[PDB]
Amino acid sequence: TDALNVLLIIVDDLRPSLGCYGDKLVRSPNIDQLASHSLLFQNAFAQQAVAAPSRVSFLTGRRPDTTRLYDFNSYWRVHAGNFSTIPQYFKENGYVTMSVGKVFHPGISSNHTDDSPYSWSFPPYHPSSEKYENTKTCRGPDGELHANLLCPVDVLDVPEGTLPDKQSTEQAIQLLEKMKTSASPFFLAVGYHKPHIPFRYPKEFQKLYPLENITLAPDPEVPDGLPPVAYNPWMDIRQREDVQALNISVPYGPIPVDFQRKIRQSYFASVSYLDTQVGRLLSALDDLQLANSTIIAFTSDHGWALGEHGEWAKYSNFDVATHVPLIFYVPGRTASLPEAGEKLFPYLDPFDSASQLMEPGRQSMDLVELVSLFPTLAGLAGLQVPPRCPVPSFHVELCREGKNLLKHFRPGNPRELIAYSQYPRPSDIPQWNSDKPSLKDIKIMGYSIRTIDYRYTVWVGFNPDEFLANFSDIHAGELYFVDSDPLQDHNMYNDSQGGDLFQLLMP
Amino acid sequence: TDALNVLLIIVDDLRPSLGCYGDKLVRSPNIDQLASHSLLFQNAFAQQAVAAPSRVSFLTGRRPDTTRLYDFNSYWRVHAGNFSTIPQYFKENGYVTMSVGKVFHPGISSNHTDDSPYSWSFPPYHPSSEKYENTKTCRGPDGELHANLLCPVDVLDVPEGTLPDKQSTEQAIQLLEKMKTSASPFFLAVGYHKPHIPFRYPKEFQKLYPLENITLAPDPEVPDGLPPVAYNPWMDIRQREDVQALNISVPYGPIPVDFQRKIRQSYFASVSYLDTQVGRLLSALDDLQLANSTIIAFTSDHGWALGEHGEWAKYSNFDVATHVPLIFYVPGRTASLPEAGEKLFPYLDPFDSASQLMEPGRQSMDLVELVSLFPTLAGLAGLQVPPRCPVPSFHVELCREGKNLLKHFRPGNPRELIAYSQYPRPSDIPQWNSDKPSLKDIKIMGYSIRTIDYRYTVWVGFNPDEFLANFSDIHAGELYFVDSDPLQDHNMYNDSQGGDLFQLLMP
Ligand SMILES: *[C@@H]1O[C@H](CO[C@@H]2O[C@@H](C)[C@@H](O)[C@@H](O)[C@@H]2O)[C@@H](O[C@@H]2O[C@H](CO)[C@@H](O)[C@H](O)[C@H]2NC(C)=O)[C@H](O)[C@H]1NC(C)=O
Ligand SMILES: *[C@@H]1O[C@H](CO[C@@H]2O[C@@H](C)[C@@H](O)[C@@H](O)[C@@H]2O)[C@@H](O[C@@H]2O[C@H](CO)[C@@H](O)[C@H](O)[C@H]2NC(C)=O)[C@H](O)[C@H]1NC(C)=O
Ligand SMILES: *[C@@H]1O[C@H](CO[C@@H]2O[C@@H](C)[C@@H](O)[C@@H](O)[C@@H]2O)[C@@H](O[C@@H]2O[C@H](CO)[C@@H](O)[C@H](O)[C@H]2NC(C)=O)[C@H](O)[C@H]1NC(C)=O
Ligand SMILES: *[C@@H]1O[C@H](CO[C@@H]2O[C@@H](C)[C@@H](O)[C@@H](O)[C@@H]2O)[C@@H](O[C@@H]2O[C@H](CO)[C@@H](O)[C@H](O)[C@H]2NC(C)=O)[C@H](O)[C@H]1NC(C)=O
Ligand SMILES: *[C@@H]1O[C@H](CO[C@@H]2O[C@@H](C)[C@@H](O)[C@@H](O)[C@@H]2O)[C@@H](O[C@@H]2O[C@H](CO)[C@@H](O)[C@H](O)[C@H]2NC(C)=O)[C@H](O)[C@H]1NC(C)=O
Ligand SMILES: *[C@@H]1O[C@H](CO[C@@H]2O[C@@H](C)[C@@H](O)[C@@H](O)[C@@H]2O)[C@@H](O[C@@H]2O[C@H](CO)[C@@H](O)[C@H](O)[C@H]2NC(C)=O)[C@H](O)[C@H]1NC(C)=O
Ligand SMILES: *[C@@H]1O[C@H](CO)[C@@H](O[C@@H]2O[C@H](CO)[C@@H](O)[C@H](O)[C@H]2NC(C)=O)[C@H](O)[C@H]1NC(C)=O
Ligand SMILES: *[C@@H]1O[C@H](CO)[C@@H](O[C@@H]2O[C@H](CO)[C@@H](O)[C@H](O)[C@H]2NC(C)=O)[C@H](O)[C@H]1NC(C)=O
Ligand SMILES: *[C@@H]1O[C@H](CO)[C@@H](O[C@@H]2O[C@H](CO)[C@@H](O)[C@H](O)[C@H]2NC(C)=O)[C@H](O)[C@H]1NC(C)=O
Ligand SMILES: *[C@@H]1O[C@H](CO)[C@@H](O[C@@H]2O[C@H](CO)[C@@H](O)[C@H](O)[C@H]2NC(C)=O)[C@H](O)[C@H]1NC(C)=O
Ligand SMILES: *[C@@H]1O[C@H](CO)[C@@H](O)[C@H](O)[C@H]1NC(C)=O
Ligand SMILES: *[C@@H]1O[C@H](CO)[C@@H](O)[C@H](O)[C@H]1NC(C)=O
Ligand SMILES: *[C@@H]1O[C@H](CO)[C@@H](O)[C@H](O)[C@H]1NC(C)=O
Ligand SMILES: *[C@@H]1O[C@H](CO)[C@@H](O)[C@H](O)[C@H]1NC(C)=O
Ligand SMILES: [Ca+2]
Ligand SMILES: [Ca+2]
Ligand SMILES: [Cl-]
Ligand SMILES: [Cl-]
Ligand SMILES: [Cl-]
Ligand SMILES: [Cl-]
Ligand SMILES: [Cl-]
Ligand SMILES: [Cl-]
């Protein structure tokens, strides 16, 4: 009897545009193969659709209103409370805990040291080539180098001759090889960068998605019923040279159709590129015979809009921005243990037109939240599940605000039917800082309820000095029905009275 | 080590107009003395403010939408499911279970046998003199007999020379004396009739409340903001001779001021009369030395309006109609065990101007529901608490839809902050059957949420054939704030958006 290892894979800005989530266009064979042996959650949502707030949230197991982190300019241990993290908890239980890539958000939100010395057994590894993502590293048709958003590259024509996710994969494999020697179990967090912007990927992956076979989003127009307060102006992508040359109006655009399809091409190519890296990582896990002793959690910190509602990027409460993939492989529970010389995660080449997305593994339609990642991994690994947090929990160091999802591997509280998301705004009209408002400039907080049936959102007055929401100062509301309006194009909040919330509360 | 006895006292139509609930006018010294040794719940509410629906609810531990009993014309075991009752459960655990007075509602709702043979050890006792309550038994100033609503009587001038609650008290005492012999513990349910109409009580109690020192209700007018659908026309009291002679308009009245004060006099007198009966019962319990081995639960099936909002009687979702008293005496837990020859419930005479309401015993402001009576008594008595019901539970015989209140004797689910009530209507405009609509005539169901902060009610379309509420067909709504509008005179539903419900759902 031993304790199970944990491989936590985090992808930056990855929406569930994956074969195992019903996407019949994107080629993600390696991730789909992971799902075939795993429990896949169809309705998992981040608590805020932006990096640091989401990562600090699900790494401490607390919600944004407990971390009080809505931008990226505060360290929770000083700002809110001495909250323990997932890797800190495993390390305190005899694990060797290791970080590769973007797990914590860099900077002050992790005290510039990836939350040292609490979380990790040694100073994390961050790939060097990431610092060239936003340099003049994209060679164009006429031979010059540019800082482009769409950046298919020959690896032999970029600085250091590599890409950050290839480095992370390589380093993760070496650490896996090392841990096969150690007597201690490992908790390995690998944080991949793509498909986060810019879309810098080996140019060969672009051939998987010719533009002729690329369509726009189903709902590229800005909906009439979308209140301006809920719109994010996607300002960061406007700074890239190729985007800047199109002279796209602020804040509503639209992006020219031809470039919209090019964005979707490069995003899809980056996903398939990401998928091969995951393939290499999981394949090495198989070769090392760790598949029967290692939990594998695969998820993302938030989604990314690709033209839906005339929106791009995250910074939103729409499903496209909050819906994330969430897959859990548990040796001998989500699948039969691998027998003699059996391989569960053999590398699959997206350039091979074969098979049929494999079969969908276990699936769950329950509404779940990233803030449940902490208790789930602690339970799946055989450790003590931290207790439920009181309200408030600024003074508690080890507790969880999310539910454990272990029951899903074999009394109806209404909150178990809800995935919560939120996002701040500095004003009602989209302006320069509406994507990523700093704490002092937040004046509105949009709180959103997502059920199997609808998304209910209210944009309410917010006081950043007292961290106080005023649910009597509702600036605007949104109500989208999954059955009739899955794309969320027809806001029904004005025609509503609140009977949907009453119904949810009524036993 | 032994099991504790249970004395469950139920009062028909008793609102918390009691000294131990802050009423500085009504004299209820014996009940207040029970409270001084008990845990008193300040915010307990029935699930529907009318007899059979409420009694079948809290006796089976299920809600009205599980019993599907909204009138008094169906037996749950045939109509909904083979639901077990509190006394049935105790009897199955070696208790002698006994019923005196109105515990179950008589008629088909209890199969005309008080739910025989499941609930009781022998056919219950019902006082004979109750059948004279609605006869010409009230002697008037000119010497004739009338069927009056206000019925102060000399006991020597009524049929059989007694009153139903005196008989019940006497019979309960005899059963207590008998059980002091038995080796088995007892579960004794005593159901008192007054202050249910008519107000027939020993006329001496009328002297405790001279009319000069009687005021009207604080809010005797019908509020402008009260939707007609939520108004009950109080038709039953209009049939009494003294009421009929005033020629009170239907359905809004008002009742003449002088008669309003007379109603309140007779109600208060009936409460003090009830209190002495409780005094006799509890005093006999003390004399028999059962105070250290007997749980005592005191409550009511619902309230009664005394002019608030121009309303009278129950059939309502207002606090006055749904708020009930709820007191739990637990030997050695809510108070120190009685030592040698100590008496905890000595009879107190309301005609003695002495003391000062005693001291308030333990108190709890948590919002609780009568449907929690089943699990609480089962726990307090040392028995296994039935499990929480699934949804739906028509097929389950033993389970509870309410929470156990044992924690109150030494994760925040929003439903633990709510007491639920409801009431049906046959139409929006008050009509002949708006007080007590029969199932087939129900077209609207008013669902109400009560928190520490507000009461939120929606009157929605209801289909009695499918037992289906349509929360998209809201006929009207109500929102009353406890802090600013404790009397519930200023409906704020039209100025509201639903942010109060959202706030309750948001962790
Ligand atoms: C913040 O907490 C860390 C570690 O918390 C540990 O785990 C918690 C679940 C709880 O059990 C704590 O009591 C644990 O200490 C603190 O780091 C410890 O600091 C003490 C002295 O300050 C030191 O002796 C320990 O070795 C440290 N342990 C670790 C794992 O680093 C830290 O001090 C806390 N910070 C504040 C400001 O309270
Ligand atoms: C947050 O980090 C600071 C600084 O971390 C130090 O410097 C980094 C570059 C890196 O090398 C870390 O490993 C270092 O610990 C912490 O402030 C330092 O705390 C130590 C106490 O161990 C003290 O000796 C130093 O003087 C401090 N440095 C400064 C500039 O004040 C700080 O404690 C960390 N916050 C928390 C909550 O742990
Ligand atoms: C929380 O909000 C309430 C309500 O906000 C008001 O109504 C909104 C629709 C919008 O018009 C706001 O600008 C309004 O202020 C605030 O209640 C107001 O309080 C002020 C000052 O006390 C008073 O002058 C107004 O009359 C109040 N309005 C109402 C409708 O009650 C309340 O002040 C806010 N609380 C905090 C702490 O900011
Ligand atoms: C309705 O239930 C009664 C009693 O239910 C009992 O308690 C429940 C918690 C559960 O444990 C049941 O299995 C128990 O029986 C049934 O009454 C019993 O009926 C059987 C034969 O029908 C008889 O042998 C038992 O002695 C009866 N027990 C009692 C206490 O009366 C009754 O049959 C059920 N009715 C229907 C229609 O299902
Ligand atoms: C509901 O009650 C009826 C009738 O109860 C009988 O008659 C009463 C006056 C009283 O004396 C009760 O104790 C009697 O049991 C039940 O119908 C009877 O069921 C018995 C089976 O025990 C059968 O022999 C009789 O013929 C039935 N009588 C009639 C008129 O049909 C009925 O079973 C009870 N319902 C439930 C769910 O228990
Ligand atoms: C449940 O209620 C909806 C909504 O009720 C409608 O709106 C109310 C304000 C009131 O005006 C009602 O009379 C309305 O019917 C019902 O939806 C309606 O369904 C009918 C028939 O399918 C259709 O003709 C209407 O256009 C619908 N109206 C809306 C606003 O959607 C629904 O039918 C009810 N469900 C059941 C089972 O009765
Ligand atoms: C929902 O209703 C609100 C208000 O009822 C609408 O916002 C109003 O828009 C008008 C212009 O048409 C302005 O003059 C008002 O000042 C606005 N009201 C407030 C409170 O700001 C909103 O446009 C409606 N939305 C939809 C989709 O119909
Ligand atoms: C997981 O599977 C591998 C290979 O299938 C197992 O490898 C064995 O490991 C033990 C010690 O861990 C060695 O003594 C054996 O020689 C290895 N090979 C075989 C064929 O057993 C590994 O033990 C498995 N892990 C667990 C926890 O059962
Ligand atoms: C709350 O609003 C509703 C509707 O907005 C009011 O009901 C309306 O009353 C008018 C008469 O003033 C009728 O002509 C309408 O037909 C009613 N509407 C509906 C949907 O029936 C209601 O009176 C308002 N209540 C308060 C207290 O202001
Ligand atoms: C409750 O108190 C009474 C009197 O204070 C106790 O009465 C005793 O009962 C036992 C058997 O039940 C007799 O043997 C004694 O003679 C009785 N008198 C005394 C003074 O003990 C009674 O036992 C108490 N009940 C419990 C459960 O402790
Ligand atoms: C688009 O897909 C179809 C279906 O396989 C394929 O035949 C066609 O060649 C694709 N388009 C291009 C430009 O390759
Ligand atoms: C961009 O467009 C605006 C008007 O839409 C025009 O005034 C401006 O000169 C344009 N800029 C460039 C660089 O084309
Ligand atoms: C009303 O109460 C006061 C206060 O005790 C008392 O003095 C007065 O006599 C009472 N009224 C009547 C009519 O007795
Ligand atoms: C009752 O009052 C109505 C008018 O308010 C009148 O028509 C009727 O005759 C009165 N009935 C009696 C019995 O006084
Ligand atoms: Ca991100
Ligand atoms: Ca009653
Ligand atoms: Cl990194
Ligand atoms: Cl170029
Ligand atoms: Cl596409
Ligand atoms: Cl009776
Ligand atoms: Cl007379
Ligand atoms: Cl009064």
Residue numbers in the entry:
A (entry chain A), B (entry chain A): 34 to 443, 454 to 550
Study authors write:
Hunter syndrome, also known as Mucopolysaccharidosis type II (MPS II, OMIM 309900), is an X-linked lysosomal storage disease caused by genetic deficiency of the enzyme iduronate-2-sulfatase (IDS, EC 3.1.6.13), required for the step-wise degradation and recycling of complex glycosaminoglycans (GAGs). IDS belongs to the sulfatase family of enzymes and catalyses hydrolysis of the C2-sulfate ester bond at the non-reducing end of 2-O-sulfo-α-L-iduronic acid residues in dermatan sulfate and heparan sulfate. Despite low sequence identity, the overall fold and domain organization bears a striking core resemblance to other human sulfatases. IDS adopts a compact, globular α/β sandwich fold, comprising residues 34–550.
Here we report the X-ray crystal structure of human IDS with a sulfate ion bound covalently in the active site. The crystal structure of IDS was refined at 2.3 Å resolution. The enzyme is monomeric with a single-polypeptide chain in the asymmetric unit. Lack of interpretable electron density prevented the modelling of one loop region (residues 444–453). Continuous electron densities were observed adjacent to all asparagine residues involved in N-linked glycosylation, and at least one N-acetylglucosamine moiety linked to the nitrogen of the asparagine side chain was built at each predicted site. FGly functions catalytically as an aldehyde hydrate (FGly aldehyde-hydrate, FGH) with two geminal hydroxyl groups; here we observe what we have interpreted as a covalent sulfate-ester intermediate (FGly sulfate, FGS) in the IDS active site, which could originate from natural substrate encountered in cells during expression. The covalent linkage is unambiguous, with a distance of 1.5 Å between the sulfur atom and the FGS ester oxygen. Extra electron density for a metal ion was observed next to the modified FGS residue. This was modelled as Ca2+, coordinated by one nitrogen and five oxygen atoms with approximate octahedral geometry: one oxygen each from the side chains of D45, D46 and D334; two sulfate oxygens from FGS84 and one nitrogen from the side chain of H335. Side chains of conserved H138 and H229 likely play important roles in catalysis, making direct contacts with the free geminal hydroxyl of FGS and a sulfate oxygen (OS3) of FGS, respectively. The arrangement of the IDS active site is compatible with the consensus TE mechanism, hence we propose a similar mechanism for IDS in which FGH84 performs an SN2 nucleophilic attack on the sulfur atom to generate the covalent FGS adduct, followed by elimination of bound sulfate and rehydration of the resultant FGly aldehyde.
